[PDB]
Design a protein around this ligand. Sequence first.
Ligand SMILES: CCCCC/C=C\C/C=C\C/C=C\C/C=C\CCCC(=O)SC[C@H](O)CO
Length: 134
Amino acid sequence: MTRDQNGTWEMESNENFEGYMKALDIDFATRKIAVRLTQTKVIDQDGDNFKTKTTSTFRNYDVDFTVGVEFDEYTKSLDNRHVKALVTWEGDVLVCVQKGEKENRGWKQWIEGDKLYLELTCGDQVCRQVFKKK
Ligand SMILES: CCCCC/C=C\C/C=C\C/C=C\C/C=C\CCCC(=O)SC[C@H](O)CO
């Protein structure tokens, strides 16, 4: 029973964020700033209802969803695309498919120990993020 992801989470590693951003066609200037940044993620979770706020000094991004309920997602101030998103549970791993113009786009997020893991995929690029609880 490790589905409880509530908390404030501070990034400690960010593997291949550059490649993931390039796969989303983020321009070089934006990538140059973004790749440097420590992200903080606040998760407010009530059962299958999630509200997430991811912040940095450069961009912030909020996304809310209910597991199992498809929603329209506009990735405002990231790559600024519209997708149809669905989050499901696979065991205790939160799995999101973002269907749209980029093939194989999604993410997976789960707890292991006292860390939160987030793997973001676009095409053949995977970014692996690890967060420690504050
Ligand atoms: C917001 C901080 C970005 C700094 C880089 C700025 C510009 C780079 C521009 C584009 C890079 C694309 C995405 C950013 C990656 C992760 C952000 C979070 C996305 C989520 O919601 S993932 C699910 C959530 O974890 C659920 O709980």
